[PDB]
Amino acid sequence: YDGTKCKAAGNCWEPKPGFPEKIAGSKYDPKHDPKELNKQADSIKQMEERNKKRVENFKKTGKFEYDVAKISA
Amino acid sequence: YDGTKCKAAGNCWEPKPGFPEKIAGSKYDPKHDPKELNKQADSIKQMEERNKKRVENFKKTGKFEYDVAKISA
Amino acid sequence: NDKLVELSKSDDNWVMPGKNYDSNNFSDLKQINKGNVKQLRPAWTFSTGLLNGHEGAPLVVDGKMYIHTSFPNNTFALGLDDPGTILWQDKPKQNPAARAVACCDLVNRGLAYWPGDGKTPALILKTQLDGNVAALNAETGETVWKVENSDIKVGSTLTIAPYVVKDKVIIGSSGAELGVRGYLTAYDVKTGEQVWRAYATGPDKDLLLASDFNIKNPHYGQKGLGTGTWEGDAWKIGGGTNWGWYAYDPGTNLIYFGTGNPAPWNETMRPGDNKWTMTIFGRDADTGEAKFGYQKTPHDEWDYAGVNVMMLSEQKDKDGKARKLLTHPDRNGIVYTLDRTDGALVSANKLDDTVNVFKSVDLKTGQPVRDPEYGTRMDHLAKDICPSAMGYHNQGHDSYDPKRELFFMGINHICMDWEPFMLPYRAGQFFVGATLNMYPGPKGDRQNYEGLGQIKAYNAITGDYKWEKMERFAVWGGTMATAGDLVFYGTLDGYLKARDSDTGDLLWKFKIPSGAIGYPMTYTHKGTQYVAIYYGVGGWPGVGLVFDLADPTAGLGAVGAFKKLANYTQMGGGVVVFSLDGKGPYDDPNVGEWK
Amino acid sequence: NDKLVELSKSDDNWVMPGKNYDSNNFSDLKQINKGNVKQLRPAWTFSTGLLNGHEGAPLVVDGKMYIHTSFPNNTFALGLDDPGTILWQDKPKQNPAARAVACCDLVNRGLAYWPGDGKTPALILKTQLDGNVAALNAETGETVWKVENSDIKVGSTLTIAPYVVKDKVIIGSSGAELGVRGYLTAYDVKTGEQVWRAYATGPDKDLLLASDFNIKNPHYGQKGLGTGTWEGDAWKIGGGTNWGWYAYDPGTNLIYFGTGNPAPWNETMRPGDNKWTMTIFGRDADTGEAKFGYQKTPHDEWDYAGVNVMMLSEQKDKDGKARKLLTHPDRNGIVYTLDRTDGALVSANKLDDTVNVFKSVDLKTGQPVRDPEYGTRMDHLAKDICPSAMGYHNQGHDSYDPKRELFFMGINHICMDWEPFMLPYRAGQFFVGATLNMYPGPKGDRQNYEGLGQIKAYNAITGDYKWEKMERFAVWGGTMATAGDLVFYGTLDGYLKARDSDTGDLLWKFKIPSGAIGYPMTYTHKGTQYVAIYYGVGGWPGVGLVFDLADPTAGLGAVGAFKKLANYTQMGGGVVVFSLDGKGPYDDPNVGEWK
Ligand SMILES: O=C(O)c1cc(C(=O)O)c2c(n1)C(=O)C(=O)c1cc(C(=O)O)[nH]c1-2
Ligand SMILES: O=C(O)c1cc(C(=O)O)c2c(n1)C(=O)C(=O)c1cc(C(=O)O)[nH]c1-2
Ligand SMILES: [Ca+2]
Ligand SMILES: [Ca+2]
């Protein structure tokens, strides 16, 4: 593996000698839990919604309120 | 009380108007616990003994040992 | 922002990180020049009241200096005519848990400024370690808006300085060591409204690619690579956070910056080029669409987080063509110069002849030629790999002299041993998977552990180094150049030094309180030129001293490499301002006195 | 110590707290004089790496500077030819609980030095907040001996600087706010062996009185007063700790110092003169026996802890007799001058005409005439009492110009409201019993809360003030005078100032990082004179800023009085060294560089 043999443009990875092309099912299988993997996406989703309430309220009232629970008069 | 009427040399305290000459038994009685009062004396007593072991050991061996439990070879 | 562009042409201001949109860190002021630097002395000082690393540099706008600190990220505004009076201070209440998810120190790179329009007042923009972004009224310090950008519960924090372009604030991200998938966001500077958000890995929709992405250099790769160069969903915790610096060309409307390293550090756990991590991007300021993306380090095996400084210039190439360029010294040991209009590779030279991880970078394929002997892999202890994970260049913001066409770069001379290990991913927990040992490179003293840095003058077209000089420690922090034929920089051992731009000769130095991990800045106030710099050692190199760590392996391998730092400096935090003969606001001692 | 006496005559050294045994803080050096102070600039700096108050001043001996810090009380030794290199550092491991029993800040007043003999090397002596005393090899920093002096479990800590006389180290005490009965101890400087220990209250055997105690002024009181002026066993938790400064006359072999306030602050809970608290003592250096003891404040009602600075001089009194004197500006608002051979009262003048707590001090009886309207008592709120508990003078170490026969004193202009309350005594817990409200005195701005200090030039025989000048904040820290007709002092708002010794005119000031609560010192290194001062605000006045307290009543009433401090300074910690034109060790920039 010297990064010179490309399968396609911008795709030049090759496994190292003695290493598999796919690690799934192998000894190096990360065995990642999908519930863990999806946590980040959920967070961003929640922050974006919390910010939307903040910005819309700000636009309407002219006074910024960071505490979402204190929003809606 | 202006500190000018002295009972004896270096003893010029007088109670203020409406105040007793002795507070014991009065409303301002501190009611100090003798067990509390004696704590300081006991501490100094213990530190002085701990230091004695340190200094004597130092004098004898030439190597200072602050940990008393590690003293006596 | 046009107002910012105009403001940036006044020597009385220093309005944004990097000085100007070119990110020059170059001043035309020559009051202080090589003939009189020896007379440079402190004029006044200010303690921030916090310890830990003090990165970045202060802003000076409208006769006021704005200062930022390490966590909890306080902000102070001082009037230049009487610095003794703190105009206003903002002291954020943040969750202490934020501290536990910072890989490195509790550092912050800086503030940004928006000039204001008619209804909205000028604003000071700041990031907080806890992931919030805030805009403060520049004259009163009151909070105008505050929004959440990152979530510490998942290991996502903010250390990056905001960047203001037109009426938008661009915010990066931090957390690749905790497997956070990188993303940058643009918010409307007046309301905090999210305008656009682009990711470093995953589906093209998430990548926010322009229809003509990589049109001129299709061999860099185009569509479907954010998932295609990964096995399964591994890209979801793929790293690529951007916590470095930006540059902007109003002419192309593109913001230039690099994306960080892929997660985990254990390369065997993520087969594939791991695309869009380690890449130089050119994204549209208004829509965030990527016009070009060049991946410097496919399938990272050394934590060469590709977030370094972007410095723009216009020089004639080897064929005599005048090009609009970007120069970028990366962690991997290579300085890249690309055409900033299309991303075409112009030059990719080694920062030091001792590199070894790559034999070279093929300019036609754009692929770096790896030397298999210095790669990392499971069940194998790699040794003598140069550069180390700290890179031959890190977070430091360098400078460029337009008249001389020379880049003055703060370099690191550190190599390493590396062995990875398997580990699970748990949101909020570290996800590194490598144990390192770092030490001085071949040109330093590996026995005494000194000689960890270098400072060099470089020409991007010829690839020639006009001069190179060794330094006791890594030149973290960056550089600043002046039309007075001086190159200024702070050192980890506690000095602000000035070198001759043409020869590199040390002309002057001053013993500041603690080591510097930020860059020097300059401005004029009432006819007098001042050079200011933060003191307060920390960041990655000072993690051992900062957290009182002893195991050479602790602090991600930095503890052992910087074992000698403590014999030359202790923590600190503040600003030292210099001027010829130390002339300043209190030359009339009655100024600032109670009456 | 004869070796110390000789060493103290070299302008290249500053070997003990106060400079010399006279405790002059006066230098004959005149390189820096009123004609050129304006050229004074920093030459180099050093951060201690800790925040909190930095009291005292550094020692310079044998081409090295020794630096001390706030808790955990680290010690650093720097070589004057290359200050950038830390020769050695001692970093004590102390129980964090020590912090909870410090009434005030986590402050420490300084180091002491013993020249060594033949077998034992020169030693650096230091106190730790946890109550341990340690001797360190001056060249290597290794611990030679370490003994326990005070017990934090009972509220006893150490903030005082050690004092070296002959081959003994004298150690004070702290804790009166927690009802700790005061005592001082002399240890053999070579082994740590306790030689003598004397108490401030109780049985004469504990008081360690000389057979001829108060022989010349028997009306001051003699035997049996340590218990006689108290009701019951109340003297057991009677206060009287000594945490201030000492002076020594090799001619009388006496160490002069004052004892602190009686406990509790609630006066109604301790009827009696509460003897030996609040008294100026003259004790034999070798046996610790008291030759004289004059009580300044019988039955304290205002926390006027009598621990202030002792400054010795020889002047002709009003009858033309040349006397060996001691001058001592107390917390109670009165400056006392006594004959240092027998304790005879020479003068007892007011620090400022606004005093009011005492109408005057009767020189024949030695009794201060109280004004009943400003006394404190249970079930009564006293108002507008001057001085406040912080006194018109606190811990600051002043100076005396022998040629001019003038004392330059850093004064406080703060008054108070006071109401006591009943409380039990529990070992380890605070035992104050008073709620206070402090504010600027009559000459300051009570609405804007500024004008809290003064600096004055005083003649002890005539009682005349040559000049008086107001300061924004209390001049904590002290003063230092020079044969260059300059008086130097640091201020709470962050400056080192220099005033004309004859007129008080402000001639120069420099904006240091944080406020100063220590005193300036000076020395020569290789022909050049340097003035050094610590920065790092704290102590009692900065307790609000240091601990982020808001209730004006918190910090024993100091929070409200110093509510404006934060607008002028933040915490810090380090040393700034000045010299003409900032000339120093790095004038040749190559010194200290890696090679
Ligand atoms: O992957 C990441 O998100 C991330 C973040 C940071 C940061 O936030 O400071 C650093 C790094 N990586 C990193 O690799 C590293 O070199 C580094 C040095 C420093 C520093 O402040 O000195 N930060 C960071
Ligand atoms: O009674 C005591 O033992 C004691 C100790 C101390 C000290 O240790 O610092 C102070 C005081 N009292 C005190 O009254 C006070 O004025 C004070 C000010 C300071 C300071 O460091 O600024 N310490 C102390
Ligand atoms: Ca990283
Ligand atoms: Ca006290």
D153, D154, D370 member nearest B2 (Cβ): D370
Token look-up 């800040």 returns: D105
Contact D493 C84 (CB under 8 A): yes
Q: What would the two tokens of residue D133 be?
A: 């005393």
Task: Please count the CA atoms within 13 angstroms of the CA of C24 that sit on its side-chain side.
Answer: 23
Question: For residue B48, what is the DSSP state?
Answer: H
**Is the CB–ligand 1 distance for residue C175 below 6 Å?**
yes
Whether domain B1-73 has CATH 3.40.50.800: no
User: For D374, which DSSP code?
Assistant: G
Q: How far apart are CA D448 and CA C277, in angstroms?
A: 56
To 5 degrees, how large is the angle CA C152–CA C156–CA C158? 100
Contact by Cβ (8 Å): D456, D469:
yes
Q: Does C95 touch chain A (CB under 8 A)?
A: no
How far is the centre of ligand 2, averaged over its atoms, from the C-alpha of C501 (Å)?
A: 54
Inter-chain touch C49–D46, beta carbons under 8 Å:
no
Rounded distance between C-alpha atoms, residue B52 and residue D57, angstroms: 32
**E strand or H helix at D79:** strand D75-79
D228 close to B (CB below 8 A): yes
Q: What length does chain C have?
A: 595
For chain C, domains (ranges, CATH) are 1-595 (2.140.10.10)
**Distance between CA C455 and CA C496 in Å, rounded?**
13
Most distant CA pair in chain A, distance? 65
Query: CA geometry: angle at D587 spanning D584 and D590, to 5°?
Result: 125
Residues in contact with ligand 2 by the CB-under-6-Å rule are D 55, 103-105, 107, 159, 174-177, 241, 243, 260-261, 303, 305, 394-395, 539-540
Distant-in-sequence, close-in-space partners of B23: CB < 8 Å, separation ≥ 6: B29, B30, D231, D268, D269, D271
Q: What are the boundaries of each domain within chain A? A: 1-73
Asked whether the CA dihedral A30, A35, A37, A39 is positive or negative, the reply is negative
* Secondary structure (H, E, C), D111-179: CEEECCCCCCCCEEEEECCCCEEEEEECCCCCEEEEEECCCHHHCCECCCCCEEECCEEEECCECHHHC
List the one residue out of D162, D132, C518 whose CA is nearest residue B67.
Answer: D132
Any binding-site annotation on C289? no
Residue in C22, C130, C167, C303 annotated catalytic: C303
Please report which ligand is nearest the Cα atom of D102. 2
Burial of C59 (0-12, 13-18, 19+ CB in 10 A): buried
CA distances from D562 to D435, D546, D568 (A): 16, 12, 11
Distances (CA, A) of D473 to C353, C505, D304, D541, D567: 59, 46, 19, 9, 12
DSSP secondary structure letters along C257-321: EE----S-S-GGGS-S--EEEEEEEEEETTT--EEEEEESSSS-SS--------EEEEEE-TTS-
Q: What does the alpha-carbon distance between residue D173 and residue C467 come to, in Å, rounded to a whole number?
A: 60
Which chain C residues touch A16 with a CB distance below 8 Å?
372, 375, 377
Whole-number Å distance between alpha carbons of C115 and C122:
5
Q: How is residue C391 written in tokens?
A: 């890179």
- D172/D161 Cα distance (integer angstroms): 8
Which experiment gave this structure?
Answer: X-ray
Q: Are D479 and D25 in contact (CB under 8 A)?
A: yes
Q: Are strands D382-385 and C163-165 parallel, antiparallel or unpaired?
A: unpaired
Q: Which two tokens stand for residue C239?
A: 């790293």
Q: Is C303 a catalytic residue?
A: yes
Hey, CA dihedral for D36, D42, D44, D48, is it positive or negative? positive
C177 is in an annotated binding site: yes
Query: Six-digit token pair at C317?
Result: 């190439």
Contact flag A3-C368 (C-beta cutoff 8 Å): yes
Three-state DSSP state, C184: strand
Residues of D assigned a catalytic role: 303
- Supply the Cα-derived Rg of chain A in whole angstroms: 23
- Across the interface, whether the CB atoms of A50 and C427 are under 8 A apart is answered no
Contacts of C218 in chain A (CB under 8 A): 9
Instruction: Give, as one character, the DSSP assignment of residue A11.
Output: B
Nearest to D594 among C470, C567, C581 (CB): C470
Atom in ligand 2 nearest the alpha carbon of residue D239: 1
Q: Residue C417: which of C435, C444, C405, C441 has the closest Cα?
A: C435
DSSP for residue C131: S
Q: Looking at the CA of residue C158, tell me the nearest atom of ligand 1.
A: 8
Indicate the annotated binding residues of D for Ca(2+). Answer: 177, 261
Contact D194 B48 (CB under 8 A): yes
Neighbours of C297 (CB within 10 A): 27
Centroid of chain to Cα D562: 20
Residue C509 near chain D (CB below 8 Å) = yes
Tokens standing for D458? 């005083």
User: Does the CB of C216 have a partner CB in chain A at under 8 Å?
Assistant: no
Residue type at D325 in one-letter notation? L
Asked if residue D256 lies in contact with residue D279, where contact means CB atoms within 8 angstroms, the answer is no
Q: In whole angstroms, what is the distance from residue C6 CA to residue C113 CA?
A: 13
